[PDB]
């Protein structure tokens, strides 16, 4: 829940990295248009961007009392 | 005042569809430019150094930033040409070459074709013949313009021919490279050009409006003419430090631009594939054959015969492409189309070609 | 959760555009709380709400490539 | 072949620092435009031009690339090669260049008072006109900067508007620091031309601007070409597409809503002025401030910089240690700042920081 959020500081660097990865993952919307269907190799590359992004977003939530 | 029309403005098919608009093919920003947009969202990069590198990239003397190729044509005609002078240009010139000339208070002379249908190739040798007929009148020619690649057929012209003639008659030469600089390699001194204009949002992977004006040292004192009240701010440049988003996207995409020009044949390979594969249906490539640019103009008699017996008239071709996630074609027009596959992945190139083959076959 | 386990799937354009917008809306916190970026109990709840919803959308993106 | 200063460019302090620079306060993109940026960073304009015409109470309106371009559009289509353009002495540098690009002459209007008000003598406009007409010189345009970019002094455009109507000379109102922050009435101030910047006061990205005009000069400004009877001459094209124009149409509901809350932006400004005049600052310009642009005289800053520290760069460095930017390094004799669009908590942070700077630096 977000209601359990405690006071804290936002990690600008981790947010910049988290938003950068989603920008790099946006290229797949262009290069794989319009079906957007990935194979096994394209999925591994794409999901690697989504996972690393969440790893940065989790570090952001850490400064507000969220453990993982 | 209704503000509802600005709320849901974030609705587009720019990622769910494959755009085949030739104007927007070379203006697609990479991921490195999108990051720069984020960093300068609110709106100090090395501007001075970028202007030296872009000059070396074009092998020119000097260079300055503009708001497109529209500005670049007006800057020279207003700083070099005197009010009333004549501008001799090719017949396949872009509309902005006439509007800017009329804004700079000048006159325009057109150069005919070497052959019309289907090539529509410009007679580069006929340039001298037109000037002589103007000087014998005698009107004074102040500028010689040549669209390196036109925006109707995408034909390439030997700019050195016109540049060699311009030098013999001692008349300035503006080489329009809106469809040239950024895609294919261009050499300023080699084509003997005095001025070179570019379109950053059409061929240099930048966002609109943006452009570059490269010129020789001969006219450096006129273009970069400083003001009197302010001995720093340039007159024709309006003393702008060139800040904002389009200039940043240009510098951010510059290493991508400088690297994709060496792989230009790989983009012509895509282009020539499309021509040689669609000509099995009934399409006929207009312009110079084979294609020397990504901008292709197919004559489509087949699409006309289907449009005469389809419920959606001539809008059937625009609708059938929407079903397959493809855009960039003028709706209602079936007599001839204008597309491009520059930058597209080869998987997407096959997707486009195979789509059209299924349209012409299913619609009888 | 490894990216190497990624199996062929389709990218959800709608669910991806929602994840981006949340990072864009949360990007206002980086501006309106500069330079210390130190939030309180209410600002954190408001901020973490966006990041939690963001990852929730990213997890639905991974759900198309053999994830749960 | 460098390619080194283009890879590591994606780095700034736009989010890690508080920007006090006046030229960028009203040009900060809201989360609305940021989403529109995402949608259109590659590849209802006709309805927007009508609404922006109602927003300024003007007859017509055209998109430009800043107030820089718009002021050249009027000077190139109306004036002759040699006509005089009478403007105030607090004019922007783009007013002298755009006139010289159209090959015009410049006549300046003296102050009503110099230090420390620097208020433009609006009644002096009538006098300057007569001094040029008697010498045979022909006046083509009357320019008036609504709010100057040096002190931020708001002038009564209705005064110069009447004088421009009596002499029959076209009136251009420079609203680069005006339109977008505060409500502007075109017909009330008796204006014939109004220019506005999108990246300075309309929360857009550069280059962005707006040119407004009456139906009297609608044919001169929107004069079409001969070869192409559709494409406008002075606009070079009816397209006018790009990234800035998108941000302007998306930030428009924000701007049209933030002009109504202009008095809330005066409260932050006057708070900064009153609270900083305690530590030893003195506001130049029209008192009290009616614009977010403030210019302080700082004798205390110049004294601390004298002995010793790192000279005039001590103030800029002390602000960087606290996460504040927007002040020119090396300049201690005076400072120019703006708190437009800043949260009140950030307004208190700036004031309390500067107070602690001059205190800790004795």
Swiss-Prot record, chain C:
Superkingdom of origin: Archaea
Protein name listed in UniProt: Uncharacterized protein MJ1481
Protein's organism: Methanocaldococcus jannaschii (strain ATCC 43067 / DSM 2661 / JAL-1 / JCM 10045 / NBRC 100440)
UniProtKB/Swiss-Prot annotation, chain D:
SUPFAM superfamilies recorded: PLP-dependent transferases
Top-level taxonomic group: Archaea
Annotated positions of the N6-(pyridoxal phosphate)lysine modification: 200
GO BP, one annotated term: translation
Keyword Transferase in annotation: yes
Family matches, as InterPro entries: PyrdxlP-dep_Trfase, PyrdxlP-dep_Trfase_major, PyrdxlP-dep_Trfase_small, Sep_Cys-tRNA_synth_arc, SepSecS/SepCysS
EC number of the protein: 2.5.1.73
Keywords for this protein: Protein biosynthesis, Pyridoxal phosphate, Transferase
Enzymatic class: transferase
Pfam families on file: SepSecS (PF05889)
Any one GO MF annotation of this record: Sep-tRNA:Cys-tRNA synthase activity
Catalysed reaction equations from the record: O-phospho-L-seryl-tRNA(Cys) + hydrogen sulfide + H(+) = L-cysteinyl-tRNA(Cys) + phosphate
Binding locations of pyridoxal 5'-phosphate: 67-68, 174, 197-199
Function comment: Converts O-phospho-L-seryl-tRNA(Cys) (Sep-tRNA(Cys)) to L-cysteinyl-tRNA(Cys) (Cys-tRNA(Cys)).
Family that this chain belongs to: Belongs to the SepCysS family.
Subunit structure: Homodimer. Interacts with SepRS.
Identification of the protein by name: O-phospho-L-seryl-tRNA:Cys-tRNA synthase
Native source organism of the sequence: Methanocaldococcus jannaschii (strain ATCC 43067 / DSM 2661 / JAL-1 / JCM 10045 / NBRC 100440) (Methanococcus jannaschii)
Phylogenetic classification of the source organism: Archaea, Methanobacteriati, Methanobacteriota, Methanomada group, Methanococci
Gene name linked to the record: pscS
